[PDB]
Write a protein that binds this ligand. Structure first.
Ligand SMILES: CCc1c(C(=O)OC)ncc2[nH]c3cc(OC)c(OC)cc3c12
Ligand SMILES: CCc1c(C(=O)OC)ncc2[nH]c3cc(OC)c(OC)cc3c12
Ligand SMILES: CCc1c(C(=O)OC)ncc2[nH]c3cc(OC)c(OC)cc3c12
Ligand SMILES: CCc1c(C(=O)OC)ncc2[nH]c3cc(OC)c(OC)cc3c12
Ligand SMILES: CCc1c(C(=O)OC)ncc2[nH]c3cc(OC)c(OC)cc3c12
Ligand SMILES: *[C@@H]1O[C@H](CO)[C@@H](O)[C@H](O)[C@H]1NC(C)=O
Ligand SMILES: *[C@@H]1O[C@H](CO)[C@@H](O)[C@H](O)[C@H]1NC(C)=O
Ligand SMILES: *[C@@H]1O[C@H](CO)[C@@H](O)[C@H](O)[C@H]1NC(C)=O
Ligand SMILES: *[C@@H]1O[C@H](CO)[C@@H](O)[C@H](O)[C@H]1NC(C)=O
Ligand SMILES: *[C@@H]1O[C@H](CO)[C@@H](O)[C@H](O)[C@H]1NC(C)=O
Lengths: 336, 336, 336, 336, 336
């Protein structure tokens, strides 16, 4: 009852060459690709890379594997994977991709009577996801995933997604778990590119990422906000207390300076200003401006004390209002 | 006396195909899995990963390997492991799993007369353990371990634990040694999942982790507690000592700010507030509030000195009581 | 219709030795090399290394592979790559080069009737790019890429670029994306080197890198510039305020000291002064000089107060002018 | 003269099965293990791991390899290593072990006429060495090294050290070079463990490590000791100098706080107090106590100045004596 | 014309055993080793390791490979490398050595009529170079490179350098490029070592390294030198300015303390004092001594003001002279 299967496998491999694609010189091989995301790994920001584990699956028609028998399907494993022809799919943006070999090489091969072949592989891709951090941290990132044939041009092998976008890409409920991102959705697309070696079809899958705020608020914004409030306390101290008010201005300014350096340590070394950078710069101006006001007041406190008192009293009201007004514009501008 | 064993091995391999599972088209293959944990490696927090070394073992029945001879068992090694059929078990949450090949590939194969097969493999799994750090550091983590067949659906290969939970999973006495965790216990479970490729049984093992406190107390809590006490010292200084009391308020506030940044450097970049974060925030309020009290007292020390003295004297008693009362509620709330 | 291809492949491999180069003892093998840069990876500064992913391609003539058939080309994959002779090309500056094996080893083999062979391979090279950081960050780097045969001297195998430089090297539009560099252009060259094992031709490709400024301005220059301005504020304070002006001088000097240490943390540990280092040193002099002026003024404020006031008033004007004048010379000198 | 050796090798491999241990079903295989330590790699503290390179050697008797010829020994290399049976030795505590393959796989095989076999392998073991840092840095660590058979129980394969302990383990003169440890000596032992798969003999080698002090003295103790002395300087300042003495107390307390955090950055995140931690805590009390004394003195300097002067004068003598006395007890307690 | 070469190769491999060294039982195999350094990689200080890329070459005589033909040499590649016998050379100090496999395994095999064989291999060695940092950074390091046979004792295989030292080791002009070292020269040597497995010849190559100063001057010495000068500024301030002079003493002392910790972060954790450590300690004494002088002066400024003024005036001259004198002795002592 089991010996029948062995004979069928031997017959298919008899006279079968794995170096030639099915339907060579008679038609164009068609491949259907479906992807299942086991887990969307962490999205490293500094290196512009993200790790993803998927069960990449490919389906194609091969008449050379047609067979007749009591069983309509032939489940198998990696043993027969190398004995037949398979597409030379590769990932363009994958900087370093490795497979899983334990406990057994994670590969499956299913063959039907008509000759249809299903081949699925488990992969871990450390792809590169360039990001435009103009609105960081209020930025949305669209990490793509490009793959295609390495040796067969568009005239020989063509990749097409199966059914709609929802069925083409599937993400596990627990797979989409990122500490500082939200997986809003996924999309797919196809395109052709002309090269010196010929035209090759490109299959691209895009993941919509919505960065979640809250870590930077507790890390960068709140220390800056409290620091600005600390500087304004000097406005409530007497002018003659030159030493006391000096500490607030000097300490606050230096505190903001180190926060900017510390804040960008995790941020990628991008050569442009981000939204957070402007917020820090504005906060730096307030603390720096407060010190200038104290110096100006202390400079004229002897010649015209009357105006000095008025400026100090006014500063107690103007500064808090401007800082509060700026926050509403800043948060509203990006949070909308 | 030794040549008899060689003939038996040759006979079993004669006409045996490793590409077909035992009992194909006649029944459903049943596999019994037992696990022994050599050492529960460190549980990295930042990357949500933990390393575990186990002696994964699988048992199944194969009638094709039945034999008769003086010896009731056939101890072997990895040499014959690849010559026969083995399940394509894999770990779903294993981000990167590698085997041990030195001195020899750590694999054993034992066969009995009835045809029962025992196959054990040594593995090192860098699995992912998502954690909800809402009660951190007073949090309990349940790291799972999911594995199953890659090519054989539930209708062909089924995994079941052997005997009770205690025998299914065994942990070495010295294996469970973590610097900041306690291995309270282990549990196992089984479930079915429906996918496009069919239904596959899932075997999950859960490890109960109870984080041990003491490192964060010496690292985060104690510096914060002493810092708050330092600020309250200013209440015992004369009001006219404006400069002296200014240093305490400014220095203490900045000290708390850097502690919050330093504390979360090791903590994962989670976008929500933890229990420790609230404690730091409350401590920040006390030191910040003390500075406000000094500023308010110094503002009215000229118009109504009588009330200024009363506020300063009262602050010496109210502040220590509130800080002490808060600790009892905080520690009692989580330590219970 | 497909069986014809199988016979052709068998005939070519019949009597073909892959250990002997084509045209041995009759002529000199000629190889044409064309490169396509999929993505120019990050250029690490500390380790003097850069990562590049390219589709390295080689073309050569082999009369032993001549064939006649209906199809003028024979697209193939890695299966036949090892069955024939290929050049032993290697990268001299490549510290650690690894290939991509997923989903399939990225290799293509195309053969024409005349016997011309096209062989392309995907590689990731962690080459070393020594840099002379004399004008850093206003420095231009020319990272080379040297490769050649390992066993065949110039008298047997010769590498030559195909057509012009533009066609020889091609860079993808999205491939050239660096956080702190601009890919101005590419150039190629050839040379011979004499060694104990014979003369070997060297193929070198140079990439022109123009570092983009803006990250260091927000990281190093701006904190230094503001720090210098902070020190000059002390010139507007009264001389008798010894304590108040002391804080500015001491704090500013220490702030510059830590910036220099922090600035070079990312910079490679080079044993020479860079352009940025001189800017920091000059800024350090201004803040340090301001403290000296205060000390000198405070030393003679009792004997000859008249001159002390004049020096303090003059310092308020001289110092800002010199710092501003220095910036124009510094920026103009390098930004030109 | 050389052809004789070839015939002998062919004869031994004729009818020899490498899947069966020598003396199967007739006796118990005995293996003698001798180890040579090429270099005891660094002992990482944070990860509780140490790297060691050894020339692991195993000797056993195999009657199937008996031969007669002019030469009494048959030096060989890795080529014949896989053609015969070898023990499946593995390291229990080895988290990740890799071999050396350059220039050639470092393996030797020597066979004598009687059939004795010598098999040595070079290995690099990243074993785990749990440490109890109760007396750190005055702590002695005993890193073990456990290995044994993976498939052959104690009833089939037994490991025994050769001759005495000195000959069993040999360490190169230059191999034992650690930056913060001393290799006092080595010891060996054997034991049996009962498991579900049977009883397996365990071979354990223990290395005696005596941590060398001097790095922490220049890194942690000395900064703390000088900081405490700095605080005591305030006792020599006038009481009315409230601001001057405030800086010493505040700055010293914060300096100790950062030292404790910095000190434990390299130390493993252990959830218990070490000997160094107590020393830091005691030093923190002295600096903190000095600030309290100043605050208490300044609080009563108006009502009863007479007692205030006495306390300040007494503090100048009591504090240095207590700090010096504590050091003698602390150093003597552990350095003995 | 090409078929002649194929026959010659087949004849040599006919009856040739790669498991037996040439001239076995008739003489002692002699191997000549020549090394070419493609690039001397970075010399990591913390891990006591350095990376080097070399074209290791070995030459030996094999009569079994004698042939007669029109061509006097047989250039080849890695294909035939494994088909013949090669020495089992290995590196003793190599902690982790890996080869280069792209584009092709970098191996060459050349055979002459007399039977001489040339075999060269490209290797990347992460060898260990212990360093005695007693005179750091004015220290000279001699990193060795030990290699030899793994299975053939001195009585069978002997390694000898070819010609003089200059020809034995060759370093590329651009290869010797280190950020903090100078490759003064190279030397070679041979020695015998007796072991339990027999006597094995050892080939050692030593590289003379002269650390280049300038990075530490801008990183450690200059901040310390300026800090000491900053402390001496307090000597020019009035005694009554207790608060002003307190800041200089406290801030400078703490600044030196953090520099010592920061300086040794890159330095290896060696348990002994280096030359730089003494310089920092001396600088610490000057700043600390200045604070003591101020405290002593302020203590007696009321009882005997006359002596207090003299001490302060004298300190302005003595301190700068001693610091300058110390530098001349320190720099001259090591820079000579
Ligand atoms: C142009 C690079 C290249 C080369 C080569 O070496 O060219 C010099 N050889 C074969 C190739 N197959 C490709 C398939 C592709 O799309 C799926 C593709 O898209 C980026 C590029 C190539 C490709
Ligand atoms: C759905 C992913 C998948 C695919 C594939 O490529 O689907 C597009 N192929 C074969 C597969 N065998 C599985 C067994 C499983 O459980 C043990 C399992 O659970 C997560 C998933 C798969 C699986
Ligand atoms: C001199 C190093 C060397 C050796 C060797 O071991 O020499 C002792 N053997 C074979 C070699 N083929 C080379 C080809 C080259 O250029 C493409 C080359 O350029 C740096 C060097 C070598 C080379
Ligand atoms: C109990 C783990 C185990 C298993 C397995 O999978 O058990 C479920 N299989 C085969 C085994 N051979 C061993 C030899 C040993 O000592 C040298 C040993 O000691 C820790 C354990 C095993 C072992
Ligand atoms: C003593 C270690 C050893 C062993 C072994 O396992 O001994 C227990 N076996 C074979 C060996 N061949 C060696 C060649 C050497 O020099 C080139 C050498 O020098 C350090 C050591 C060995 C060596
Ligand atoms: C790519 O080429 C194929 C050729 O059949 C064509 O059908 C398809 O529309 C092309 N795709 C695009 C995006 O142009
Ligand atoms: C999974 O499927 C099998 C089919 O035999 C069934 O016996 C078992 O109860 C199912 N498990 C669950 C959790 O539903
Ligand atoms: C290298 O050698 C070849 C020998 O044919 C010669 O044609 C070529 O001009 C040489 N190249 C250089 C740069 O000298
Ligand atoms: C282990 O078992 C063997 C069985 O022969 C016995 O000889 C030996 O004494 C046992 N060792 C220990 C430590 O019990
Ligand atoms: C090593 O042994 C050989 C044996 O022939 C001898 O010639 C050589 O001088 C010895 N080398 C040393 C350094 O003793």
């Amino acid at each position: 009852n089991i010996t029948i299967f062995t004979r069928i496998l031997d017959g298919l491999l008899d006279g079968y060459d794995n170096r030639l694609r099915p339907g060579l010189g008679e038609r164009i091989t068609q491949v259907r690709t479906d992807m299942y995301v086991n887990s969307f790994g962490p999205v490293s920001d500094t290196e512009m890379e993200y790790t993803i584990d998927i069960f990449f699956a490919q389906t194609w028609k091969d008449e050379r594997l047609r067979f007749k028998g009591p069983m309509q399907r032939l489940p198998l494993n990696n043993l027969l994977a190398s004995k037949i022809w398979t597409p030379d799919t590769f990932f363009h943006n994958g900087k370093k991709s490795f497979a899983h070999w334990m406990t057994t090489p994670n590969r499956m091969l299913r063959i039907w009577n008509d000759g249809r072949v299903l081949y699925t592989l488990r992969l871990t891709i450390s792809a590169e996801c360039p990001m435009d951090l103009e609105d960081f941290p209020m930025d949305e990132q669209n990490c793509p995933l490009k793959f295609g044939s390495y040796a067969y041009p568009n005239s020989e092998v063509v990749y097409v997604w199966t059914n709609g976008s929802t069925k083409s890409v599937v993400v596990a409920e627990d797979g989409s778990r990122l500490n500082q991102y939200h997986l809003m959705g996924q999309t797919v697309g196809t395109e052709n590119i002309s090269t010196s070696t010929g035209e090759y079809t490109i299959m691209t899958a895009h993941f919509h990422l919505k960065r979640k705020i809250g870590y930077f608020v507790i890390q960068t914004y709140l220390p800056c906000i409290m620091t600005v409030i600390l500087s304004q306390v000097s406005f409530w101290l007497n002018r003659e207390s030159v030493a006391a008010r000096t500490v607030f201005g000097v300490t606050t300014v230096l505190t903001m300076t180190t926060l900017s350096i510390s804040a960008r340590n995790s941020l990628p070394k991008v050569a442009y200003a981000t939204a957070m950078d402007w917020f820090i710069a504005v906060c730096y101006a307030f603390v720096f401006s407060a010190l200038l006001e104290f110096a100006f007041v202390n400079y004229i406190t002897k010649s015209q004390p009357a105006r000095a008192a008025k400026i100090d009293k006014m500063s107690r009201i103007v500064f808090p209002i401007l800082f509060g007004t700026f926050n509403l514009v800043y948060w509203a501008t990006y949070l909308n």
